[PDB]
């Protein structure tokens, strides 16, 4: 018989953080449908001009309701472009992840902690996606990834592992590798229970005593 | 500690087959080298001319030793154009298999056997690597993938699973994700035996009754 798409995929989430090419906002939607994945954040966009993107547009913090990804953006999404037109357009990683429980910062060792690969990484997320859970894979900048704020704003190191003498992989790739693994596994078996772990927005209230008892 | 690349890595082939696109090659080479292999086999090319490729090399049967690929090939390969330049180029799918043991088509339910993913055949094709057999992986025209004769071919047929309402997934990117996939399975653990399977030359010999006793 033929599977349909686990309901909690829609739990979990694609996160693109200072991204210069409208193209690869495209691409990162049809990447995701394709694996069954329907839900982008984009966050604080800063795009350059392309061939097909003369003027992009200027991200404003103060004004997110007037930002519109260039049709480039949409060029390339394809069938998917529903997925952009449903995006999440955000100032902050914090804005971003403030309902998720788990959140994954795509890095390489440039440096301190363990790093998991996807692999590796995955189980966890769709047990969590399955209790409910928000969960979030965090992408950063073509040229300079995820800067270390970024990275502290998640709890969990991805990494995407390959040949030591040689590794090139761009962000589409990257996207297109990771929404691949998640699919990979939802032929996985998934107990039906009784959970409650802490969002990222009550983490952050936690750990500055703005909790209420 | 850190794994250097296992050496059975040296048996897998990536054999592309009517390839349209220059691009295509050269990302192929890219993908391919980001995930340790290093080998890779082009078949009866039919490039189509693109703005950077004018004029497209013509492909002819007969004198294979012409046949230069166009530099729009090379330029996407970047630090991976050693692969292209170590690339075998052939004119049948079978002078391509003639010394391996496993071969597998990448196709899509256009209809009749069942079809395996990345996740399940890779075992098989490593530990086959490991024995010193050598395997294949072939990927067939962006258009119009495998003809009916080259999955004949193949004693494998081998599908990316997706979204079954939407699945949108270009050659660069099956050729990343099946890359991907067996460098992901790197770690698992080899018995060093003492094995022999027959390879395609020698299949097609027993079939034709050609083989001599």
Same mark, same amino acid.
């Given at each position: 018989?033929?599977?349909?798409?686990?309901?909690?995929?829609?739990?979990?989430?694609?996160?693109?953080?200072?991204?210069?090419?409208?193209?690869?906002?495209?691409?990162?939607?049809? %990447?995701?449908?394709?694996?069954?994945?329907?839900?982008?954040?984009?966050?604080?966009?800063?795009?350059? %001009?392309?061939?097909?993107?003369?003027?992009?547009?200027?991200?404003?913090?103060?004004?997110?309701?007037?930002?519109?990804?260039?049709?480039?953006?949409?060029?390339?999404?394809?069938?998917? %472009?529903?997925?952009?037109?449903?995006?999440?357009?955000?100032?902050?990683?914090?804005?971003?992840?403030?309902?998720?429980?788990?959140?994954?910062?795509?890095?390489?060792?440039?440096?301190?902690?363990?790093?998991?690969?996807?692999?590796?990484?995955?189980?966890?997320?769709?047990?969590?996606?399955?209790?409910?859970?928000?969960?979030?894979?965090?992408?950063?900048?073509?040229?300079?990834?995820?800067?270390?704020?970024?990275?502290?704003?998640?709890?969990?190191?991805?990494?995407?592992?390959?040949?030591?003498?040689?590794?090139?992989?761009?962000?589409?790739?990257?996207?297109?590798?990771?929404?691949?693994?998640?699919?990979?596994?939802?032929?996985?078996?998934?107990?039906?229970?009784?959970?409650?772990?802490?969002?990222?927005?009550?983490?952050?209230?936690?750990?500055?005593?703005?909790?209420?008892?």
């Amino acid at each position: 018989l033929k599977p349909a798409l686990p309901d909690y995929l829609g739990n979990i989430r694609i996160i693109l953080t200072r991204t210069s090419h409208p193209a690869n906002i495209g691409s990162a939607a049809r %990447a995701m449908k394709t694996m069954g994945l329907h839900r982008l954040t984009i966050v604080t966009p800063n795009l350059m %001009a392309t061939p097909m993107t003369e003027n992009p547009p200027v991200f404003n913090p103060d004004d997110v309701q007037s930002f519109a990804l260039p049709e480039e953006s949409f060029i390339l999404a394809s069938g998917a %472009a529903d997925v952009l037109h449903n995006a999440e357009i955000v100032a902050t990683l914090d804005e971003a992840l403030a309902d998720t429980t788990i959140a994954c910062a795509l890095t390489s060792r440039r440096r301190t902690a363990p790093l998991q690969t996807p692999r590796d990484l995955v189980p966890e997320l769709l047990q969590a996606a399955n209790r409910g859970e928000k969960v979030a894979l965090v992408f950063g900048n073509e040229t300079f990834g995820l800067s270390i704020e970024e990275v502290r704003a998640c709890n969990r190191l991805m990494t995407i592992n390959g040949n030591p003498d040689y590794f090139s992989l761009n962000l589409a790739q990257a996207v297109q590798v990771v929404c691949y693994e998640i699919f990979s596994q939802t032929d996985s078996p998934m107990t039906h229970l009784q959970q409650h772990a802490a969002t990222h927005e009550q983490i952050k209230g936690m750990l500055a005593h703005m909790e209420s008892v």
